[PDB]
Amino acid sequence: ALVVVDACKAHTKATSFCFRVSKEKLGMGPPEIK
Amino acid sequence: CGGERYLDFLRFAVFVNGESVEENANVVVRLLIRKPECFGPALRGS
Amino acid sequence: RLQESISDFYWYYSGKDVIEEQGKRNFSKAMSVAKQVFNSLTEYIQGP
Amino acid sequence: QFLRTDDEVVLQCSAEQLKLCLAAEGFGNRLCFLEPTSNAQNVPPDLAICCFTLEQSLSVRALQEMLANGHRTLLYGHAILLRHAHSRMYLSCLTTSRSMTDKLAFDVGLQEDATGEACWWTMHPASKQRSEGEKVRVGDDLILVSVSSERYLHLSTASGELQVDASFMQTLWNMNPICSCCEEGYVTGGHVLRLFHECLTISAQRR
Amino acid sequence: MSFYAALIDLLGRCAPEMHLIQAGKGEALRIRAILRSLVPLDDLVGIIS
After folding, report:
1. Nearest chain A residue (CA) to D195
2. How many CB atoms lie within 10 A of CB D142?
3. D103, B45: Cβ pair inside 8 Å?
4. CB distance from A1 to chain D under 8 Å?
């Protein structure tokens, strides 16, 4: 969640993270991340 | 008393001249066990 | 439907060594109709 | 669009409507259980114990001579051998009975031995829309039938919570392929991986 | 009881003979495993007594 939290109190608003290349002001999946 | 008339019908198909057939006995056991209501309400449980 | 029936007829006779006159009767019966539908299919596509 | 051999699937049912993915722990408590997964908005489920891969797909008389002794698209009426992804063993139907009510239901659980008497499962269509000899789609309700014991893997609502059993009740299940054949060199979801930059790790209450 | 005795002996006459159990037929011991587990033994030991 930066700490790790138990599974019962883990929510969508508590634990949800993402992967991006850079922060600017903005079938199977496509192979974007290597 | 009503369903006993259908059960003594099916002894004549699965048992002929004192020897049991294999093809008709395989298909009547396969058909009876998918429906639990064809048995009595005790075995379906007392 | 005819492919899976003759193929399962082969898998039933895959363990036995020889075939009796009953089995080669039914196999030539199934292969002759299989040739007729093969002749029915090619004349559908022999025209351009 | 159509399932193949070597795709990881998750067996789930419907019961408000709530999906119960069939997950198996392994190395302890081999009898399978079910998981609530419509409530992912408040609690996340564990799908690492739900990945089941389809290793081989044969027909009915094709398995018969093998017990007597790459990617193939499976059809209706065929057999399938589901194998777990964490514990690498087969989902079969054992001889025991844990219902204790003489309902004639065998419990379904995992096996290490590769005997194909009880490890194989045959599919059947739900409705008259699809018959034997068609190919399976994503999201079609299927009916798995055991070979040796000849019962159907269904959801039991008799005693307590919802559990799985092999009995003579037809309950429809969804296959839902969770992972197809992935190209090497790209991340997918569910992968066990590290975060090298040093490693992002914990101490040996470790929060 | 007339329905149940017609139910029981029907389950008896559809049972395979001894020479199918003596062979390696996986079908015959499957049917005998269903009918032995459909109807228990000691219930019949009490009824015959």
Report:
1. A19
2. 18
3. yes
4. no
